[PDB]
Amino acid sequence: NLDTSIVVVGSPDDLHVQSVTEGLRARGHEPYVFDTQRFPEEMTVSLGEQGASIFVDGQQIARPAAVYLRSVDADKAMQDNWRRTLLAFRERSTLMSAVLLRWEEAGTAVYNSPRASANITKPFQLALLRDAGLPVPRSLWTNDPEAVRRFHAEVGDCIYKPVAGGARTRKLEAKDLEADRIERLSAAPVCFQELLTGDDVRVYVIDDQVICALRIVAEERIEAIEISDEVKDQCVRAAKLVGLRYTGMDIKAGADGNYRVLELNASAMFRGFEGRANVDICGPLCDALIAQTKR
Amino acid sequence: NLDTSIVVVGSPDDLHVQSVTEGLRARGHEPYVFDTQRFPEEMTVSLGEQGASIFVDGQQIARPAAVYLRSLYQSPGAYGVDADKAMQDNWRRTLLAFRERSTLMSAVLLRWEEAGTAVYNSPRASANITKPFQLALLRDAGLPVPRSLWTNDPEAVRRFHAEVGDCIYKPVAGGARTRKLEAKDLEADRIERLSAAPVCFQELLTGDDVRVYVIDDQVICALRIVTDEIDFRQAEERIEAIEISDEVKDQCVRAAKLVGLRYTGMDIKAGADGNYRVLELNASAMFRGFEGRANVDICGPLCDALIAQTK
Amino acid sequence: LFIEDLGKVTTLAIGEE
Numbered sequence: 001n002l003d004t005s006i007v008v009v010g011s012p013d014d015l016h017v018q019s020v021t022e023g024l025r026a027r028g029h030e031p032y033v034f035d036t037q038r039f040p041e042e043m044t045v046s047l048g049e050q051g052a053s054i055f056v057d058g059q060q061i062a063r064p065a066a067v068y069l070r071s072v073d074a075d076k077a078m079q080d081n082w083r084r085t086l087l088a089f090r091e092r093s094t095l096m097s098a099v100l101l102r103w104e105e106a107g108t109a110v111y112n113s114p115r116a117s118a119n120i121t122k123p124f125q126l127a128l129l130r131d132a133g134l135p136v137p138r139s140l141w142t143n144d145p146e147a148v149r150r151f152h153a154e155v156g157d158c159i160y161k162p163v164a165g166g167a168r169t170r171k172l173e174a175k176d177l178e179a180d181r182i183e184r185l186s187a188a189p190v191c192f193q194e195l196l197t198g199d200d201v202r203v204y205v206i207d208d209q210v211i212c213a214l215r216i217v218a219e220e221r222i223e224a225i226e227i228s229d230e231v232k233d234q235c236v237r238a239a240k241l242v243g244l245r246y247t248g249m250d251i252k253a254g255a256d257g258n259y260r261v262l263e264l265n266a267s268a269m270f271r272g273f274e275g276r277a278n279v280d281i282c283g284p285l286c287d288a289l290i291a292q293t294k295r
Numbered sequence: 296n297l298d299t300s301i302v303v304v305g306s307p308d309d310l311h312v313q314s315v316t317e318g319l320r321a322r323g324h325e326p327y328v329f330d331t332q333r334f335p336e337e338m339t340v341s342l343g344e345q346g347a348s349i350f351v352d353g354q355q356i357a358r359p360a361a362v363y364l365r366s367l368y369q370s371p372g373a374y375g376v377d378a379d380k381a382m383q384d385n386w387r388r389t390l391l392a393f394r395e396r397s398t399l400m401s402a403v404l405l406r407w408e409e410a411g412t413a414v415y416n417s418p419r420a421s422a423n424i425t426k427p428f429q430l431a432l433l434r435d436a437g438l439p440v441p442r443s444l445w446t447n448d449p450e451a452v453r454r455f456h457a458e459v460g461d462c463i464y465k466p467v468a469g470g471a472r473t474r475k476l477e478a479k480d481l482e483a484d485r486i487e488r489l490s491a492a493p494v495c496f497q498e499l500l501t502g503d504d505v506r507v508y509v510i511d512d513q514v515i516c517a518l519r520i521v522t523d524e525i526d527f528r529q530a531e532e533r534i535e536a537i538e539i540s541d542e543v544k545d546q547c548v549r550a551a552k553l554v555g556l557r558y559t560g561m562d563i564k565a566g567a568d569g570n571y572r573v574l575e576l577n578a579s580a581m582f583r584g585f586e587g588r589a590n591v592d593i594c595g596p597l598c599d600a601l602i603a604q605t606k
Numbered sequence: 607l608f609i610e611d612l613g614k615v616t617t618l619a620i621g622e623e
């Protein structure tokens with residue numbers, strides 16, 4: 001009845017789900033859309049003990065060819081009984097994650113498999129990259145003020161990111177190293193990094209091939225550029241180390257003109273980069289999703 | 296200045312953390328106890344960009360030989376975490392704090408495993424431990440499991456019931472006791488509550504539960520648990536070490552390997568035909584109550600496996 | 607919840623995970 005060969009996990013209200021579905025339509029494959037936001041209350045999924053017994057809304061969906069994995073009101077529930085609500089969410093999440101893991105084991109090429117979460121833990125991700133020979137910034141995750149005083153003394157001017165991600169990057173200034181200012185991190189760990197003076201670059205990788213790279217120089221004026229094949233090689237290597245099929249990397253150049261990998265993203269956005277630099281991101285992604293169906 | 300050759304991850308108030316540290320002392324080794332629950336306030340962690348650059352309370356710990364991973368206490372809803380007041384106060388920032396701690400401690404553990412540390416139950420196995428995937432991995436690998444149905448659709452439940460017969464229901468991921476699927480439960484009124492969350496229905500196996508302990512591809516023992524049905528005023532649990540055929544032993548070892556566990560207490564159960572089906576492998580199984588009621592030594596073999604990594 | 611006693615509590619039924 002439906003294709004169930006290429007599956008997009010996410011909400012129809014999502015711009016990226018929309019783009020990917022449009023690119024697959026314009027390419028000849030109307031994809032099945034697993035809108036897991038409907039899971040418990042509206043839609044229905046049933047798993048049997050056999051890995052192929054996966055039934056979504058009555059229709060068996062064992063082994064899709066490829067999956068694009070993109071993605072609540074409960075403050076009352078969390079204040080009335082938080083233990084129960086957290087367990088309920090774990091029941092749901094468990095069944096959904098099981099669907100995805102079953103497909104991956106069946107042979108499905110899941111574009112960004114949740115198994116990558118392990119390798120994606122930032123404080124471990126950068127160590128994976130460096131310990132495999134890739135250029136990464138000198139970094140320090142700590143809640144120890146003396147550690148950060150020594151790190152600053154050794155590397156020089158540096159910056160600090162939130163540990164898990166969300167905020168802007170700020171520069172560590174001498175005023176911050178005082179006892180009053182530096183003591184704050186006694187219970188507020190952040191990530192300190194050598195300050196790279198080059199220009200930020202976002203590079204997209206899909207199936208061991210770079211798609212593009214944009215320097216994001218006032219209004220955003222991100223413009224497409226071209227980089228060496230050495231750094232292309234390093235980027236695809238990084239993506240194969242972390243275990244990602246489609247990644248949007250952040251790399252920054254040092255004063256010496258050499259790039260350092262900053263961070264790979266589990267599922268990077270592109271609707272705002274492809275419009276501001278006039279390159280095609282969703283295109284090559286849909287091409288890969290379809291290419292998997294051949295084999 | 297500290298022999299971080301063996302590291303026990305867990306709160307020092309955990310009866311199994313205590314049991315393992317005591318075992319290790321009797322063997323001559325002083326374990327380092329890594330209590331993540333004190334992270335922001337009473338512990339110091341510093342990670343460099345290099346996998347070897349790891350500093351806990353000032354000391355460098357690049358690569359322990361072995362780790363016994365009791366618990367990292369990642370969510371406030373775990374076993375050893377008294378987080379009730381904090382969650383009642385501001386549950387959003389408390390979940391934030393637990394996620395912040397977890398990313399760092401998981402980084403530590405993953406760095407260790409990357410360096411070659413023998414992590415007795417590495418956190419990565421979490422992926423394989425999701426039940427609705429674990430049971431299928433086992434089944435498609437040749438091990439018998441119960442006829443199952445994880446679902447939120449009452450019609451699927453009714454048809455599964457009509458196909459199997461007596462059924463039990465239990466949590467998808469865990470957190471409550473399995474019960475017999477009674478007729479009251481199939482009435483629309485309460486079977487329509489599956490729209491709130493799915494549950495696991497299974498064929499009611501009538502045999503006896505058997506807990507098999509596996510450490511490094513070798514079965515330590517197999518304890519049959521019996522509910523003493525004789526006197527109803529005081530039901531007791533009789534646990535007995537029993538011998539299992541080599542077929543069962545090799546199947547248990549294969550399952551432990553498949554999921555990705557070193558130390559595992561897996562629950563199996565026989566059907567009417569008297570043959571075992573695998574119920575579930577645990578990632579941080581307990582063993583004290585079984586040792587006591589069955590007069591077997593599980594902590595000993597664990598401590599020895601840990602110490603064998605240092606050599 | 608269909609399993610109403612999911613949250614009723616030191617939850618010990620999750621002590622082996």
Ligand SMILES: Nc1ncnc2c1ncn2[C@@H]1O[C@H](COP(=O)(O)OP(=O)(O)NP(=O)(O)O)[C@@H](O)[C@H]1O
Binds near residue numbers: 497499562
């Ligand atoms: N198919 C089944 N038939 C009969 N009893 C079962 C079945 N599956 C599980 N049980 C019972 O449940 C127990 C095993 O626990 P299990 O259901 O695997 O974990 P859980 O109770 O959900 N929580 P946890 O023990 O923390 O994993 C056994 O002692 C059985 O009595």
